[PDB]
Design an enzyme around this catalytic site. Sequence first.
Site, PDB file in Angstrom:
ATOM      1  N   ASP A  89       2.919  28.342 -44.282  1.00 25.00           N
ATOM      2  CA  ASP A  89       3.278  27.143 -43.543  1.00 25.00           C
ATOM      3  C   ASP A  89       4.259  26.336 -44.376  1.00 25.00           C
ATOM      4  O   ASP A  89       3.983  26.024 -45.547  1.00 25.00           O
ATOM      5  CB  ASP A  89       2.043  26.290 -43.225  1.00 25.00           C
ATOM      6  CG  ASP A  89       1.168  26.923 -42.149  1.00 25.00           C
ATOM      7  OD1 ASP A  89       1.684  27.739 -41.360  1.00 25.00           O
ATOM      8  OD2 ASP A  89      -0.018  26.579 -42.084  1.00 25.00           O
ATOM      9  N   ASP A 137      -3.865  31.827 -46.361  1.00 27.10           N
ATOM     10  CA  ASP A 137      -2.481  31.444 -46.109  1.00 27.10           C
ATOM     11  C   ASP A 137      -2.025  30.559 -47.264  1.00 27.10           C
ATOM     12  O   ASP A 137      -2.805  30.199 -48.148  1.00 27.10           O
ATOM     13  CB  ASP A 137      -2.338  30.712 -44.770  1.00 27.10           C
ATOM     14  CG  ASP A 137      -3.141  29.420 -44.726  1.00 27.10           C
ATOM     15  OD1 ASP A 137      -2.609  28.377 -45.129  1.00 27.10           O
ATOM     16  OD2 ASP A 137      -4.323  29.465 -44.296  1.00 27.10           O
ATOM     17  N   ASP A 166       0.429  27.012 -48.067  1.00 22.61           N
ATOM     18  CA  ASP A 166       1.011  25.822 -47.459  1.00 22.61           C
ATOM     19  C   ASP A 166       1.938  25.130 -48.442  1.00 22.61           C
ATOM     20  O   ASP A 166       1.546  24.877 -49.582  1.00 22.61           O
ATOM     21  CB  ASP A 166      -0.111  24.837 -47.025  1.00 22.61           C
ATOM     22  CG  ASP A 166      -1.156  25.507 -46.166  1.00 22.61           C
ATOM     23  OD1 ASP A 166      -0.826  25.859 -45.023  1.00 22.61           O
ATOM     24  OD2 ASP A 166      -2.285  25.699 -46.646  1.00 22.61           O
TER      25      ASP A 166
HETATM   26 MN   LIG Z   1      -1.688  26.845 -43.367  1.00 23.11          MN
HETATM   27 MN   LIG Z   2      -3.973  26.723 -45.887  1.00 21.51          MN
END
Ligand SMILES: [Mn+2]
Ligand SMILES: [Mn+2]
Length: 325
Positions: free
Chosen positions: A249, A193, A195
């Site tokens: 995120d 992912d 961020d």
């Molecule tokens: Mn994340």
């Molecule tokens: Mn992450």
Amino acid sequence: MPAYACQRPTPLTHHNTGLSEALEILAEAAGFEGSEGRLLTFCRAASVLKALPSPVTTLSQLQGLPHFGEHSSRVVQELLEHGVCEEVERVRRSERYQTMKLFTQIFGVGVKTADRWYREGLRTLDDLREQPQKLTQQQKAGLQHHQDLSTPVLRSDVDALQQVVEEAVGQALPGATVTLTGGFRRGKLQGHDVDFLITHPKEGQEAGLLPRVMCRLQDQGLILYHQFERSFCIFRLPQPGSWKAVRVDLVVAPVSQFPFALLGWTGSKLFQRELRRFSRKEKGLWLNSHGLFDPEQKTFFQAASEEDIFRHLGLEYLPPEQRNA
DNA sequence: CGGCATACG
DNA sequence: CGTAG
DNA sequence: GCCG
Ligand SMILES: [Mn+2]
Ligand SMILES: [Mn+2]
Ligand SMILES: [Cl-]
Ligand SMILES: [Cl-]
Ligand SMILES: [Mn+2]
Ligand SMILES: [Mn+2]
Ligand code: NA
């Protein structure tokens, strides 16, 4: 060797990879059974090995290392003697471990949901897809995109996403900044992912920012899933003649809190837990991603940098690339 | 023996 | 319950 | 599971 992970540099790559990976299997399995205490010990023991300056070759070298008792030392001993630890291998091939791993890795599914599904007899993703009525929208998105979400995100992906996030942030609030956090800031070349931490240099101007950012990304057709100050999204990332889903995120913090949010979101997870444990138990201060609180004087520490926070806590500064606990 | 980090969505 | 580090 |  200090007892807290925040007291020692831990690089991304190290000299005891196989030993730490085995201990982290046992840590993961403890978590699947709800034993957070054993999870923490195995996690810390693994991290200690990551912080060592050379390979462990003999059981002797475990003497005096924090968080190595009879159990973790036996694991290491068997790996040194036979190249494999029977307990670790038993966990690896257990139906319980494999299914809890598969289920908990779904965005929207935690240990408790996975455990209930396991007890109901469910074992595969197709088992879950056959009964959507029980799934949440978040779980339906996690299962729909599960295959893409299991594919590593690369640095090339990160730079493209950052440019796109900056574009929407710039329209939502001129002057707002976007900072890459998480594992990539710690030097990882891949991740599961991406961020980002968003702020504005004029305290208070960031209020209400995240909805404006999300609506702009939504109108650009880039949001496959979204739900405030934290947004857990699935982005549509262009690819060669196609695209792939990527977990992103987005987090907003006022500039007064930015150093604490940067510290927290840069991780690692164990590093942050150890840092907060150290803060409370050794210094009597309460730390989170918003600030650092003295409960005696009832005051918040003002920080202008991560360096300020380490100084406040009496810790030698560690750059993100040495926070890979 | 008690503790094990601490938030937001 | 999920999410984050 | 380990520490203090
Ligand atoms: Mn994340
Ligand atoms: Mn992450
Ligand atoms: Cl436990
Ligand atoms: Cl927080
Ligand atoms: Mn033997
Ligand atoms: Mn807040
Ligand atoms: Na999950």
